[PDB]
């Protein structure tokens with residue numbers, strides 16, 4: 354059975370969990386206590402040498418980097434559940450393009466907003482409000498491009514839900530809830546409808562209700 | 566014929582060019598003048614809506630994000646030239662893992678060092694030397710993990726050259742030449758041998774000699 358390492362409430366393990374749930378892959382979650390620095394202990398560094406989560410162990414196979422992991426399980430269980438990769442090479446390419454947009458243009462801004470507004474105060478530290486404002490300004494412009502895309506396509510990589518949409522679920526949920534920046538989605542009609550659609554998927558609702 | 570947009574001397578188009586050369590894919594390079602802001606003009610924003618390079622046009626197919634593009638051509642010409650993806654799903658997964666390590670752990674530090682030390686002075690601006698030092702400190706620790714990996718494997722994803730190694734070529738060359746930080750590679754025996762190997766590949770030598 355697949356072992357997934359990391360907290361269920363953290364963005365990066367959530368991305369992996371969402372894919373496994375969508376694909377109907379049974380897994381065991383192994384909590385890693387990030388606040389206390391368990392991820393930097395020698396024992397865990399043998400699993401993930403950069404001292405980050407997630408990492409998966411599946412028999413004698415080990416893999417880390419969340420977006421590598423979701424690609425692997427989407428392919429390994431390609432014929433089970435939803436088509437998360439696309440079929441033609443050109444369809445697959447658009448999924449890859451919007452995964453790459455997620456992983457830099459979007460996440461570099463969004464995860465750092467969540468870090469400053471949510472993570473730091475939770476471990477008793479002050480966030481940098483002026484830095485957060487610079488991120489917000491940049492993110493408006495990034496999300497204007499998302500809105501343009503979603504005016505022409507139901508989902509980011511085409512007319513169906515794929516890894517590209519899935520990969521946005523964890524950081525976006527923190528952005529529009531704990532971080533109080535829901536307007537970035539609500540201000541944009543197509544983006545908002547996309548968000549309310551993908552975040553209502555049964556696999557995601559399951560994952561978030563368990564997390565609290 | 567494939568059109569690749571961007572300067573031949575820029576890191577991001579170089580990544581794409583290296584893959585096309587390795588796969589024996591003919592292409593036309595269309596220079597985009599980044600220093601003067603051509604990439605932010607309406608005409609180019611129709612090609613790449615985030616105002617960045619590269620973007621490729623291949624008949625009626627358009628694609629951007631450099632790492633999506635190299636995945637696409639590695640698959641489209643899978644049986645031509647080198648096996649850049651891996652064969653089994655588990656082999657493919659390790660290529661993906663080390664592409665993801667490149668794209669955040671490594672590149673977030675390396676491209677920002679190159680930005681500060683090389684790009685900014687070239688457009689008449691001062692780099693932030695103290696910020697560069699913080700990047701260097703972090704990058705030593707990242708490259709210690711690369712050294713550990715390369716002590717156990719000839720290349721990053723296995724015993725053969727793949728997209729994972731290829732994707733490191735452009736930013737690493739700037740790091741160890743123009744940025745004057747060659748010691749980060751030279752200090753590490755396995756990493757240095759890996760670098761001198763992959764950067765001596767005919768496709769890469771071709772690309773860099775043309776660039777000047």
Ligand SMILES: *SC[C@H](NC(=O)CC[C@H](N)C(=O)O)C(=O)NCC(=O)O
Pocket residue numbers: 363364365366387392404405406407417418419420665669
């Ligand atoms: S969300 C939890 C953190 N993980 C990562 O940042 C992983 C990023 C990788 N690029 C990936 O898997 O996608 C984490 O472990 N935070 C704790 C820490 O000490 O960094």
Ligand SMILES: *SC[C@H](NC(=O)CC[C@H](N)C(=O)O)C(=O)NCC(=O)O
Pocket residue numbers: 453457575576577578599604616617618619629630631632
């Ligand atoms: S290296 C040239 C710059 N491109 C990118 O930063 C592209 C990053 C993407 N994530 C990718 O394709 O990998 C560039 O265009 N610089 C000029 C600018 O105005 O940003």
